[PDB]
Amino acid sequence: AIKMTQTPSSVSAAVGGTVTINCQASEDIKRYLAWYQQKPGQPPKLLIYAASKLASGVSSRFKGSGSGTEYTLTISGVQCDDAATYYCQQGYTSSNVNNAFGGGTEVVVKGDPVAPTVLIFPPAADQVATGTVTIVCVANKYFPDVTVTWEVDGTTQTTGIENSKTPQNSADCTYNLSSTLTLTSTQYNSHKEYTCKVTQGTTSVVQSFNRGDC
Amino acid sequence: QSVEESGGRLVTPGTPLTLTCTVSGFSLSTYTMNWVRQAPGKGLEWIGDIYTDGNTYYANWAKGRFTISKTSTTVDLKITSPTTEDTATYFCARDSWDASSYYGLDLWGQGTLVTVSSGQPKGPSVFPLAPCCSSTVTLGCLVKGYLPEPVTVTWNSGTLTNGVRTFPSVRQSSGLYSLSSVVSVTSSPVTCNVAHPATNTKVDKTVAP
16 A cells, blocks of 8 residues: 655654654655644644645744655744644545555654642542542643652552653643552552652652541 | 534444534535544544545545545545444545645544443543642542543633643543543632533532642
């Protein structure tokens, strides 16, 4: 089939820097090629058509080039508002296709660093009563990425953990993260101190509570 | 001109489902229409299209699994025998061509959500998040056990918006969804309003320090 191979799958750039994304077609697609930007929750937005022409209203910081089987999108003067997933797409044929789109490229924009604000929430009484509890730890407004470690009476947890990170903030590049630890009510009662540890670089921020004091 | 999709819903595997794309302000004798889907967190997948003249084309994986048809103002996508792999937001989008100039997919709908599961639709359980027992506080609510997506969460009926952070939902191993929302307030009644339209339900939980 006609195949679109988009690389790399992820790229990062400082604010003000340049991002380059490549698209390889398995057959000569003769510049019948478009580029899109997409942010979570929204449909994609056309940026470039006919390989190198700017769609209406799109900034000239976005540049399309290439021909035959090899195409490139360049983004200059990168801003937080550009943090998104980018897709190429061939409009050369609808026959013998598996996917008209490339696999996408996530662009991470490195803005001003910010240390996380961390909070821990013990499970409410109404949770304990269901047989299962979820302990919630949140890391708010941070950049670059952090690691979360959960500790129960000083033993590192390796199971029962789920992490959910927002997309980058389009104004300031920061993330928010929720991390949850889920245990049976019996398992939860089998221990005293519950700790969320959030590490950025080498700097750790810790929040804890004692099950008893709740 | 505009495009809008409808018909997405929770459906059991094997139950045929038809999606509809209604178009306004342009002709389907000028524009070609395309169906594109996207599973949560994943890339765009072209499903197929229907040209101005009526010729329909499907992606190789999609042949025999979908049928596309159109009238003068709508385009249908029928999903023949849904499987759990078909869970996704489905978009309708228009494209066109000039002499040698492919114009791209320039107009898209907001998408319609298809969820394929043998599970029954289920409303959320809502649990308060408060610090263990400065003058300002962050409170929250943990919303768990719902299907299908989405739920909406507001604070004090949308009047509290500053300092609100809602996290993306997470599918559980049960196949149910969870999300959480926190709000920072000055410690002066703070209520999270959780709506789940798919089960005709709304839950208000007043969160206590």
